């Protein structure tokens, strides 16, 4: 029963090996697993000058995770031929907490091409600039909301019983009980936030001279940067174009 | 697709220890044509490339409505989408009123009235109601647009009438699926090119 | 006992490989499988110089996904020769969430192309273009109405039981009780709403010059893109078609 | 007892394999079987300049679906020997949402063959074009009524019982002690509504000149096309004719 598992093992990790060998920039690989909690361990040679993108690492890494049964795309630790550990998934004293920087870089990177593809017609191809801050907001937010509509009218309050007892003698003793059951109107709101929402955005764009531009050109470039960017008064972003000549 | 990979392939091999995933083919007017994707999570960046599909197409369907009437090049345009990924389930539960007695549904109703006469009266009256009841269970998308900003660049020809400009501006909106209720903004400028 | 598992899945893997071998622009694949939940990892060796497209990738994945007892398409890793996992399901996200844009897209073009089959007998073949936008709703919808009718008028109540003691001395102190028990009707509906349907379209048609459209012209044009759209004002639908020369 | 059900199944796909390429326009099939749900995936090489129509898939997706114990027609994956995923039930990513679109277009192009077989004996072959969008209610609906007649008059009412105690001293003390029991007409419908009903018609259709068309003649064609519809007030159904020379 041992000694089968392990010669199953030992011919699976060459099989697997094998076949990631043969797929390019991949003069050999070495995987090694840990069945028993799993994991494995893939020490790819690629092939001299080369280097698999950062999504070229989830290639091996589900081609690993996947052809092993149980086995989560977290464990696999991917290293170069001078080590190079690639996956940061492996060095955990945070490993989640740097990857809002790569995020923010993306969203901010967005942003910039966008507001550089909007004035590079009107300025010229190389006369803007921008660079953009975003505050992101990682919080994590759950919301319960419950509310009641509110039945303190009786031409819209909802009974489902109600007993009206009215007593009168006539020195004038009357009496009026009166229990009354409701139904009430109910909503019930759950929403789950976003992790990795925008926060707050400041841009800061310098457009060339050609001689100052006009201030009615300038201000219409300030209203397609600010329609570049998905400007809100609500999220308080700021926006500064400033004209000046580059060098 | 398969012939950006040609020149990615192209430029990276080319330089040594330059991998492909790293470089940014753009054409001459935005158009980042390189997929990239980012590790960490892999769900919160799902949501960028999601984002840039439905600005591009929006994009796409203002520069292929007004590229017959300005040109095929004199018009550049860029949407930002600032979309809702919260997951949203949400539960209403109505009650129709029955105050009036004239719309109230009885299931029982134990009516006793005396009366002596020093009038010495009494009414009592248990009432037992079904009542109309409405349940609505919404799980909200997650992925609407929540608001649009467009700005559109036109060149001049000299500058375009006002009145062509008031109805570049009208196609523009029915290109975005323009809402006042999500405070979407457009903003359309005719300058001349470069 | 294990050494026929492993066998019987060695010769499946081989048997499955050379049948998507068999596929066109396929040099050699290589499926690995997964089975004890299972999963698959296939890194397939495409002819050189062609590409899979999107959903040709889920004709081989639910060739693989369903030739494999228990194991769903959401599993199965393909991975080019070059790096590049092409299938993005890896995440725990948001691969349904653009199967909406396609399915957007879909809609859209199908009213384009109505617009243009019927305006294209009166304009001329490329004298029209229109560009839809569908606002669509993919939220999951649930209701349950319950509706009572009134009882209240006598003349259309049901009594199912009805007790009237009726006491009279006569100083006239009289006595009326009167328990009523009431059958009623009731309807129950029970919708479960549609996930897809067009909240509201926004239709741009240009027609070009022949030379001014006349007024009239442009009004029947008007009418029957309003008629190819599904116009409905309870929708909020909007319509603007301009007539302007081409280039 | 496993090898034995291995060396069967992994015979019986050949059995079956062969079965189907024997079928005209196939020059090679490769029927896979999982069954430990079941599940089957069949890879078939068409005849050089051939197809399988939609309704012959059918014909081969039954063919397997029955020669196999439990496996429905649901989970068999066809592809072509060119990807071509040719059975859509086995799409991954909801499987639904645009079945409807085919749906709708069916309906449609059925509507709009009819107008145009029609009117084509009148104006001509092709001196008419018509565009039929279909809006169609998906929402699954049940619905549960249950009515009661009134048993308000006496002359109408059903009794089980009655108990009718009548006292009376003669000063005039009376008493009337009246219980009674009723049996009460109750219907009970229970609607299953049809999933792809048309809730409202939009058609627009042109004629082409011979010279403007009398209004007499117009009234006619109108009149005509809206029998062709199925038009009708309480869907909200809109028509549109002009009359517009062609181009």
């Known amino acids: 029963q041992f000694s089968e598992q392990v010669n199953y093992q030992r011919a699976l990790e060459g099989e697997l090996a094998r076949t990631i060998e043969?797929?390019?920039?991949?003069?050999?690989?070495?995987?090694?697993?840990?069945?028993?909690?799993?994991s494995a361990s893939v020490t790819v040679t690629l092939e001299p000058g080369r280097a698999?993108?950062?999504?070229?690492?989830?290639?091996?890494?589900?081609?690993?995770?996947?052809?092993?049964?149980?086995?989560?795309?977290?464990?696999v630790t991917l290293v170069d031929q001078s080590g190079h550990l690639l996956t940061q998934s492996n060095t955990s004293g945070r490993d989640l907490n740097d990857a809002?920087?790569?995020?923010?870089?993306?969203?901010?990177?967005?942003?910039?091409?966008?507001?550089?593809a909007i004035l590079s017609p009107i300025v010229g191809n190389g006369n803007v600039h921008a660079q953009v801050t975003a505050q992101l907001d990682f919080a994590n937010k759950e919301q319960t909301e419950?509310?009641?509509?509110?039945?303190?009218?009786?031409?819209?309050?909802?009974?489902?019983?109600?007993?009206?007892?009215?007593?009168?003698?006539?020195?004038?003793?009357?009496?009026?009980?009166?229990?009354?059951?409701?139904e009430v109107d109910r909503t019930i709101r759950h929403t789950?936030?976003?992790?990795?929402?925008?926060e707050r955005l400041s841009v800061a764009v310098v457009v060339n001279y050609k001689l100052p531009l006009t201030a009615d050109q300038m201000k219409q470039i300030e209203d397609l940067t600010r329609e570049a960017m998905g400007f809100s008064d609500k999220r308080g972003d700021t926006l500064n174009v400033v004209n000046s000549p580059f060098s």
Chains 1, 3, 4 share one sequence.
């Not at 809002?100 to 550089?116: G, H, M, P, T």
């Not at 009974?159 to 006539?170: A, F, K, T």
């Not at 789950?192 to 925008?198: F, L, R, T």
């Open 22 to 38: 043969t797929l390019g920039p991949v003069k050999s690989a070495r995987v090694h697993l840990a069945m028993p909690s799993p």
């Open 52 to 75: 698999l993108d950062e999504g070229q690492i989830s290639a091996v890494v589900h081609l690993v995770s996947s052809a092993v049964a149980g086995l989560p795309p977290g464990n």
């Open 100 to 116: 809002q920087l790569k995020f923010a870089n993306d969203v901010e990177s967005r942003i910039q091409r966008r507001i550089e």
């Open 146 to 182: 419950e509310h009641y509509s509110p039945n303190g009218d009786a031409s819209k309050a909802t009974l489902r019983s109600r007993q009206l007892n009215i007593s009168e003698q006539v020195p004038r003793s009357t009496q009026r009980n009166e229990t009354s059951n409701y």
């Open 192 to 198: 789950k936030m976003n992790v990795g929402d925008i």
